[PDB]
Structure formats: C-alpha cells, structure tokens
C-alpha cells in the first residue's frame, strides 16, 4: 500500500464522477431517481445524500494542497444540489405558508420534482408529498455543509424561508407523514402516520439549526435561525 493519497482519492474520484456526478442535473443541481429511462422525477431525500457523497469526498480532498481543482468541484457539487433543493422549496412558498398554519397532507412541501426544471411533477393525489425527513434532512444537512465552510444561503430572504422551514418542521410532532418510503405504513392505504425516523430527523435538524448562522464565518446577528425550544421538546 505505497500509493500516494492522491491515488486512493482518484479511485473514489472516479466513482462519484462516473456514477453520481455525471448524472447530477446541470440545471437544478438535483439528482434524478432514475438514471436511465428519461424520467424527470427527482426526490428530495435521496438528492440530499448524493450531494453529501461529493461533500464527503470533498472533505477528503481538503487534505491535498494539489487538488487540481477537485475540491471546489466536489464542495460546490453539494452546494449546487442544496441550492437547487433550496430553490425548489421557494418555488412552493405558498404551500409553506399553508402548512405552517394548517399542517395537512394537502398543504405540505412536495417531495418529487422535475430533475430538468424543478417543476412539480406529481400532485398530492398521485404522490404522498408529506415527508418530514426530506425537509428535516435538508435543514440538518444545510447547517452540516455550512459549518464545514460551504456557502449555500446567499441573502436574508433565504434566511426567512429557512426560518419558516423551521416553523414547518417545528410541528412534525403532531403531523403524520408518509415517511421515507412514501408509503405511510405497511397497509399502504394512503393514511398518514407518525414515524420515529421522520420525527427524529426534525429533532436533530432543530438541534443543529438552532442559533446557527446561515452565512457561515461571514455572518452577523441577522442571519441566525431561532428554534422554539418547546416545539423541539414536544
């Protein structure tokens, strides 16, 4: 095992570039569910992981001064997805206001989007869009990448939406959801239930995003996110 650390990362460089970074959507930064078939469907939850995979290799790529520009290619591969993931949610900011006031399966943020436009693909009837983890995993990952130095939140207007995204996640203790496998339960009757995996992610998301500056090292008192301690406790 005399290979330089350049060599082992190049081994992993290939895999991401050939198997994940080749298929990253150039427009919305999203990651399509189906690599082949022409499907436009991109899910919120899985696309978060794909960016994190490039992020994980990007942090490994922080250990080389001669990265040949690979680190920024993989660091901002995560940013492109998260901002595209961020971009998709505003596109539905009217739903966010409704879900904040009346948590319901018909007012929630969507979970599947057009990989090439970010437009909504399946309606509430077609697809069960109430998936708290996807919103929670976004907030948990968003602070996770920002703390490492990636810059995803760009202006104070995004701060308000992410702040409002907290208000939606603050109420997942009582709002049932379809969960990660978009089925709801084993019976698959379309009836929503409370899931520990979805509920736990929001608790972790609220824990990390509490008091976290979305602007990173370049931030002040107007870029922190405030989390209701009572809502987290419930």
């Amino acid at each position: 095992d005399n290979e330089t650390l350049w060599d082992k990362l190049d081994h992993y460089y290939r895999i991401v570039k050939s198997t994940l970074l080749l298929y990253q959507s150039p427009t919305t930064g999203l990651f399509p569910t189906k690599t082949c078939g022409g499907d436009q469907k991109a899910k919120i939850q899985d696309s978060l992981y794909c960016a994190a995979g490039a992020w994980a290799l990007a942090l490994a790529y922080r250990r080389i001064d001669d990265d040949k520009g690979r680190t920024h290619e993989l660091e901002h591969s995560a940013i492109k997805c998260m901002r595209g993931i961020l971009y998709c949610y505003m596109r539905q900011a009217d739903k966010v206001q409704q879900f904040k006031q009346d948590p319901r399966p018909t007012t929630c943020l969507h979970s599947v989007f057009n990989v090439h436009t970010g437009d909504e693909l399946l309606s509430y009837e077609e697809y069960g869009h109430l998936q708290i983890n996807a919103v929670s995993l976004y907030l948990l990952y968003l602070v996770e990448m920002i703390s490492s130095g990636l810059q995803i939140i760009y202006n104070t207007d995004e701060v308000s939406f992410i702040q409002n995204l907290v208000f939606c996640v603050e109420r997942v203790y009582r709002v049932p959801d379809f969960g990660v496998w978009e089925r709801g339960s084993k019976y698959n009757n379309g009836s929503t239930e409370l899931h520990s995996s979805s509920v736990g992610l929001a608790k972790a998301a609220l824990e990390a995003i509490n008091g976290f500056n979305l602007f990173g090292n370049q931030g002040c008192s107007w870029s922190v996110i405030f989390v209701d301690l009572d809502a987290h406790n419930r």
Binding site: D102, P103, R174, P176, S191, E193, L194
Partner: protein, 272 residues
C-alpha cells in the same frame, strides 16, 4: 374516535358542536381532565398502563358513579360543583393502583368502567386466539382466528383495537372486567396447559354464566340467597381466594377445554 391527531381548529368542533349536544357543560368537564390526564401521563406514566384507550366520557361516568358509592344514601356531590383540584384528586384516587377499601364489587365497577386491562392482556388473547379454531365470541361479536392471525402480530398495535372492538359491546362494566379475567383465566390456563385446545366457538358469555350458576349452587348450599340473576354476589367475590372468581372461571374453562381432544405432543412424550 381520534385514531390520529388533529389540529386545534378541528378538535374545537368535535369538543362542542358535533359530539355533545345534550349538555354544553359536558365539554367543560371533558376539557378539564384531558389537561389533568396530561398531568398524570407525565408525572405518573404507569398509572395509565393497561388501558388501550382513555375514554374520558366514560371516565366522567366512572367519575360520577363512584360519588354515588362515596355519597351512600345521600344526594351525592355534583361533578359540576367540585373545584378542579377535587376533580384531579378524585381522578388520582380512583385510578390509583390497588383501589383501596373497595368491596371487590366497587373495584370491578371502577376497573370495568375504566377499561383497565391487565398488563399483557392483549398479548395473551392473541395467544388465546392462536390455538383456537373457532375464535372468541363476546356478547354478539366474533373474533375469528382468520384473517386475524395472518394479518397481525402478537405485539401488533392493530390487533389491540380489534379485541377491544370485540369487548366494546359489554354494556355492563363489571361484566367486562369479568370477561377480561375469564380471558386472562384461559390465558393462564392455555399457556401453562399446551395440550388442551378448543373445538367449537368460544362464547365467553356462556363461559361467564356457567361459572355463575355453579357459583350459585355453592352459596345456595351456604345460605340460599334468594336473589336470582344477580351478578352482585359474583363481583364482590375476590379473584383469588378460597372460592375466588378465578377458581369459578377456570372450572368453566377447564370443562370446555376438556370436552375436546387432548393432543399428544411430539415434544413431550406421554407416559400413559
């Protein structure tokens, strides 16, 4: 039935408009305990163990009925006259564990109206439901072995609702508690006694009465009580004792099991 949680807007119309219209003040007392229950479930979680459902409306009936016992031959205190702490302290007193100084009739009224079931009762009826071909019949409901066994699990939460639905028709609360002990009795019978299986349907009502009549003949031999079709002599009888309700019940379940085939075990060889 609130199977899944709703929003403050929705529960408002359920509390006042659609549920209760006989008396508007029913909601005010109704709205009281659900805060008190919230206090207990946090400070004393164990106290609400064994009950699958907290029917507060029946708790009010339990709340008011015990005062009739507490008040005796006197106009009892009105639940709408007590201060909330008295309602809370009343709630703690009669939902305490070992109900104290209650003729076992009053324990059975409180426990039966309270729908307090033994810990693992739902697990044991599943086992009862497992090795019974013709399921369980309770006062005009039928709990079959199929598709119940195939569609559920022994620890499954869905199965618990069905058995309660099977027992939901027991109008008389102390009859329900007698039903569960009978349901317990066969459970403590069946799991220790793995050879005896039912052949026909298990109608607990027939199991309940036949225990009572064979109960009736012994006490008639003692003092010849002239009350007929009165369960009161059975409820004040303690579950465990010289002649306890369980001992009467197991005789009933012993005979019905004994009217079927004694299956020899491959695991346990027979000496005779």
């Amino acid at each position: 039935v609130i199977s899944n949680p709703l929003s403050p807007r929705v529960i408002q119309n359920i509390i006042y408009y659609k549920c209760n219209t006989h008396d508007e003040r029913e909601a005010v007392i109704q709205q009281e305990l659900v805060i008190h229950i919230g206090w207990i479930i946090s400070n004393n979680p164990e106290l609400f163990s064994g009950m699958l459902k907290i029917r507060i409306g029946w708790i009010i009936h339990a709340m008011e009925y015990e005062l009739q016992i507490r008040g005796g031959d006197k106009p009892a205190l009105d639940l709408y006259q007590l201060s909330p702490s008295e309602v809370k302290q009343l709630l703690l007193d009669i939902l305490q564990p070992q109900q104290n100084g209650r003729c076992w009739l009053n324990r059975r009224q409180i426990d039966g109206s309270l729908n307090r079931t033994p810990t693992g009762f739902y697990d044991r009826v599943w086992q009862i439901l497992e090795r019974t071909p013709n399921g369980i019949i309770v006062a005009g409901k039928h709990l079959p072995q199929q598709p119940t066994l195939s569609d559920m699990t022994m620890y499954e939460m869905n199965f618990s609702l069905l058995v309660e639905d099977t027992l939901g028709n027991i109008d008389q609360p102390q009859y329900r508690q007698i039903v569960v002990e009978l349901l317990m009795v066969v459970s403590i019978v069946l799991e220790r006694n793995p050879e005896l299986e039912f052949q026909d349907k298990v109608d607990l009502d027939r199991l309940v009465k036949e225990a009572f009549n064979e109960f009736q003949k012994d006490q008639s031999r003692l003092k010849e009580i002239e009350k007929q079709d009165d369960m009161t002599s059975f409820y004040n009888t303690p579950p465990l004792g010289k002649r306890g309700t369980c001992s009467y019940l197991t005789k009933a379940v012993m005979n019905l099991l004994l009217e079927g085939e004694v299956k020899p075990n491959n695991d346990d060889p027979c000496l005779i």
